[PDB]
Structures are given as C-alpha cells and as structure tokens.
C-alpha cells in the first residue's frame, strides 16, 4: 500500500575503538545532539555526495559534467555549503568538483536549525534552542517550524524570528 | 520430549536453582550455541533448561518473578 521503508543510519564496523569514540563524544557535546543515531544519519548524508563527485570526474561519456556536474553544484549552493560559482566555465566547475571532496562533517551540522537559532543570537546555548524550538516559538517568515533538525536554506536563513503569537511575542 | 518421545539430558544453569523443579514438572530447553558440541567442562550434555512451568528461570534467580 506504499513502501516498507528504509534505513537512514548505519553502525560502526567495530564497537569499541578509542580513536573513534573520542571524536564522536565531542560532536554530540559541541552541537547538543541527542544520541549517536543522529550523527550517523548525517554521516551517510555527507558521504553520498563524495561518491557522486568522483564518478563525475572519471567519466568518459562526454555529456555528464554539463548535466549532472552543475546539477549537484546547484543543490549544494541552495543550502549554504558551497560558495558562489560561475556555472558557465568548464574549468571553474571542475575546480568546484575538487572542493566537494575536501569537506568536513561540520559544513553539514551547521546548516541545521538547532545551530541557526544560536548563531543568529536568540538563545543562550544549544540546550535552550532545542527547548524553545519544540515549544513553538520560532517561525521562518510564515511557518511555525517545530522539529530541531530542519536543514535551513541559504535564501531563507535571515528571515528567522520569534513567533509573533507566542509568549515571547507582542500579542 | 513431548513431541517425539526421545530421552535427553539438560543442564540447569544457575546457583541453587535445581531445587525449584520437582519431578513430573514441565520444562523448556534450548541449545547451547556452539553448532552441536558441548561447551566448557560439561561432558555429554548438549542442552540447557530455560523455563520451568512457563516462568523464566533467569527471572526467578534475579527476583523479578515468583516461583511456580
């Protein structure tokens, strides 16, 4: 009647490895994540793109970089991960397909709503932003967004505000 | 074995737990987990008591349930 579903996360190949357990305890500390499932969700998201860029460079089919090259560069720019590239020069693009491979897992954890109610100063810390996103006190220009994992867009970032009908509002 | 009428021996795991069972009791047994060989220093036994009259044997030992 639809689909069974699918899995968003994965699991580490070896459970108890200290060089991997030390840097994961930081990310759930500096960004206030809720458990390890949220972090392996975002790793798979960020790893799909790299595997997509390498195939676009070793491609003998001459009509690939035009269509699918720039397609994947528009999609990143829309979210605030890459800068601004002139999508008309064959060399200014293939250098943009070389900066996709040199990325962090911080360029993705920072386009997320729990961290955007912090940079644009509205909350004390990332343990308060989660407490008043769920309380229905943030509104992206018309919408009362309520889930602290909404991945904001570039051309919609500055429009954040309080909820003009909430207790933190004027009415 | 109620299903096939074969005779078997099984091992009763925990401390002081052989004394909840009586004779003419019913019991659920399962494997050991090593492909049909014996494990440790227990010779000849390939099975393991699990329940005693529909109550978990591991829960009676930890105090979560009451004896039958």
């Amino acid at each position: 009647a639809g689909k069974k579903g699918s899995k968003r996360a994965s699991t580490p190949r070896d459970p108890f490895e200290k060089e991997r357990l030390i840097r994961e305890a930081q990310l759930v500390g500096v960004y206030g994540l809720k458990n390890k499932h949220e972090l392996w969700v975002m790793e798979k998201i960020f790893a799909k793109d790299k595997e997509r860029a390498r195939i676009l460079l070793t491609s003998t089919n001459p009509e690939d970089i035009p269509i699918n090259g720039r397609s994947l560069l528009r999609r990143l720019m829309k979210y605030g991960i890459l800068g601004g590239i002139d999508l008309c020069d064959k060399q200014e693009v293939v250098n943009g397909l070389n900066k996709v491979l040199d990325l962090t897992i911080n360029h993705y954890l920072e386009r997320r709503l729990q961290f955007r109610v912090f940079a644009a100063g509205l909350a004390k810390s990332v343990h308060h932003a989660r407490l008043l996103i769920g309380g229905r006190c943030i509104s992206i220009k018309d919408q009362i967004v309520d889930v602290p994992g909404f991945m904001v867009r570039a051309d919609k970032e500055p429009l954040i505000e309080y909820n003009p009908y909430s207790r933190y509002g004027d009415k | 074995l109620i299903a096939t009428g074969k005779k078997i021996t099984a091992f009763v795991p925990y401390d002081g737990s052989v004394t909840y069972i009586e004779s003419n009791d019913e019991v659920t047994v399962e494997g050991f987990g090593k492909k049909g060989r014996s494990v440790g220093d227990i010779p000849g036994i390939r099975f393991k008591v699990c329940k005693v009259q529909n109550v978990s044997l591991h829960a009676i030992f930890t105090g979560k349930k009451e004896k039958p």
């Binding site: 009647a1 639809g2 009509e63 970089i65 035009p66 269509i67 720039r70 397609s71 528009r74 999508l87 008309c88 020069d89 064959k90 060399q91 693009v93 | -």
Partner: protein, 259 residues
C-alpha cells in the same frame, strides 16, 4: 483459469491514463469496440479527470444518462465506451469540441478546436475485402466503407466525413510529407519524411523534427497528417511535438557551458 476476467487492478492500468497509485484497488475496465485495447481510454475518465466536470460518479452518470455527450457525432451513454486517437468529443450545452491527442511525454491530451474542424477524422487503411457483390475497405478504428475509389490501398490516410461517414480524399505516403507517431519509443512526435527504405519485409521512414533533430521509425507506428510542412490537415497542440533533449533543458535554466 479458462474463463474471461472482468476486473482491473489499479497497478496494471496503462501509464497514459494518469491514474493515482492509491485511490482504490480497481480501475475502469474498457469495453470492446472501435480501437484496440492498448490504444484507448474509457469515456468516463475523459469527463471527470480531463475536464473536471463531474466531481463524483453519481454526477458523472447524470451527465451521460441525460444524453449530453457525442463521440464522433453520435450520442453515447456508456462510461466504458473506448475513445481513441484523432476523435472528436462534442458537448451541446456550452458548445465545445475537442480532439484526442498525445503529449510528448506520451500521456493523453484534450485539444480544443473549432466547429468546422469538428467534422473530420483521419485513419489508415488496413484491410480490403469483397462480400455479397460490394467492395469494402477497413479503417484503423475498425469501420468498413463501401463504394470508395478503386485506387486506395494498404497504408494510405483517408479523411472520413464524421457526419455522413464517407471518404473525402486521401494521402499517398512519399518524401516531403508530415507524420504523427502513434506508438512505440517515439510516440507523440511529428516529423517530415526524408528517405524510405526497406528491410526484411519492413519499411522505415527517416524523419526530421520541426527543430532539426533526426528520427526513424517503422511504417506501422505512423500516420500521415499533411501534404507538406505548411499543409497539415489538423491543428497540432501547443508545443507541436518537439521533445527537446536533457542537454537542451538545463541550458534554458542555466545557460551554456563554454570553455
């Protein structure tokens, strides 16, 4: 399993009908009659999904039992009646006429036309036989016409009156004509013949779109609709059947990529 089936599950309905995957388990089963089964749509979907007149089925059966519809100038009251390619649908109140076509995405399409264009039909000649002392020819929508010219053969396009059902004039296929592809890989594309060659009992038409693209297709998936590039016998849809490729669709949205 030796007796005929009377139901359609919705997963198996043709893609041209544009039916939603959910929305029930069944779909309307079409009746026998004029066109083939893989080349028709039931009448009841055309009045409630492509015109959005009736919002229901209690209402759709008030529009058909009050005798307000005419397929090819002939009243129809059955919602399972099948409608095919190049057919005229008329509606008296709120006087209108439509012709049944395809997209370039190969879906169905209703194209509004005028009143002196709603007296036409184009079909191919497929069979030819003699019975009882009369010569006949068989259309591709299935009719027989008696007492036509003695010089009409298999393949030619004929123009049917649609208000007396009699031939008017025809087209013989040759270079510098126009074509509509009614099925296959290239369904819904209009071209202009360049070469006609043969193979192991086949004829293949090299074609050329109205934008320069090239083309090729057998003679069983094509109907002639014109004498030359400015003498077409029907009105084409908004886009004329171009099918721009996917290189040429991002440049529209993104510009070119020069070195």
């Amino acid at each position: 399993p030796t007796g005929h089936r009377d139901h359609l599950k919705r997963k198996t309905a043709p893609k041209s009908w544009m039916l939603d995957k959910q929305g029930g388990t069944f779909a309307l089963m079409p009746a026998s009659g004029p066109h083939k089964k893989t080349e028709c749509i039931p009448l009841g979907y055309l009045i409630s999904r492509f015109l959005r007149y009736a919002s229901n089925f209690k209402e759709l059966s008030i529009i058909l039992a009050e005798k307000n519809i005419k397929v090819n100038g002939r009243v129809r009251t059955n919602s399972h009646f099948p409608v095919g390619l190049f057919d005229v649908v008329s509606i008296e109140k709120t006087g209108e006429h439509f012709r049944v076509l395809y997209n370039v995405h190969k879906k169905f399409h209703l194209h509004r036309i005028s009143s002196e264009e709603a007296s036409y039909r184009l079909t191919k000649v497929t069979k030819k036989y003699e019975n009882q002392g009369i010569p006949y020819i068989v259309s591709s929508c299935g009719l027989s016409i008696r007492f036509c010219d003695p010089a009409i053969d298999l393949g030619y396009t004929i123009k049917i009156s649609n208000e007396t059902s009699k031939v008017i004039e025809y087209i013989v296929p040759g270079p510098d004509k126009v074509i509509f592809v009614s099925r296959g890989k290239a369904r819904g594309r209009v071209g202009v013949i360049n070469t006609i060659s043969t193979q192991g009992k086949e004829t293949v038409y090299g074609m050329t779109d109205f934008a320069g693209n090239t083309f090729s297709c057998t003679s069983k998936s094509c109907i002639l609709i014109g004498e030359s590039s400015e003498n077409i016998w029907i009105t084409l849809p908004k886009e004329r059947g171009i099918r721009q490729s996917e290189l040429e669709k991002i440049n529209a949205q993104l510009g070119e990529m020069i070195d």
